Design a binder for this molecule. Structure first.
Ligand code: GSP
Ligand code: MG
Length: 170
């Protein structure tokens, strides 16, 4: 029997970066330009025999949005530089609301739009590296690395759960 884990996570980023489309791709495995507080996804991780149930929040209301979150995806649109400049503001808002740091994966979304991309891979890698965040290039449209981004976040939250278990068991 696998180990069981449950986490609330938050989708962060400016308007139209693809927060909803990424969540739809992850939970319902499709994409629709005309697709109209949280989604649920159950995910198995074979390498450690662990089962994760996720609450993926995507939206006073701000404080309830962040409360109880154990992780998040920090998205920007590689075709719009302003959305990349603002990811620091989203990180600060989350950490300030929670009054603590939570793991974040930096997600450079819409990488299928090669002809209109303005934020280079190395820029996102450097920001994530400066914050000890993982970095993922994703496309909700093609599905590229979408499941990987959530899976990597799950593994980090699991290792942090294990860290806390050991701290409480000295
Ligand atoms: N080409 C391409 N288009 C994408 C991708 N992800 C989202 N889009 C498109 O970009 C637009 C915005 O995506 P959306 O999911 O609504 O972002 P959002 O962050 O949820 O936007 P908001 O509701 O917070 S304002 C939509 O038209 C969607 O179809 C992607 O990976 N590749
Ligand atoms: Mg949305």
């Amino acid at each position: 029997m696998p180990a069981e884990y449950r986490y609330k996570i938050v989708m962060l980023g400016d308007g139209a970066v693809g927060k909803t489309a990424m969540t739809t791709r992850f939970t319902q495995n499709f994409f629709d330009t005309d697709y109209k507080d949280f989604a649920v996804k159950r995910l198995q991780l074979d390498d450690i025999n662990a089962h994760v149930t996720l609450q993926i929040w995507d939206l006073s209301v701000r404080q309830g949005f962040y409360r109880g979150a154990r992780g998040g995806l920090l998205l920007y649109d590689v075709t719009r530089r302003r959305t990349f400049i603002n990811i620091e503001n989203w990180k600060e808002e989350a950490f300030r609301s929670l009054q603590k740091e939570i793991p974040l994966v930096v997600v450079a979304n819409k990488v299928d739009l090669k002809d209109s991309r303005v934020v280079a891979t190395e820029e996102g890698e450097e920001y994530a590296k400066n914050n000890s965040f993982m970095y993922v290039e994703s496309s909700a449209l093609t599905g590229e690395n979408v499941e990987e981004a959530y899976a990597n976040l799950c593994r980090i939250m699991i290792e942090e759960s294990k860290d806390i278990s050991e701290m409480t068991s000295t």
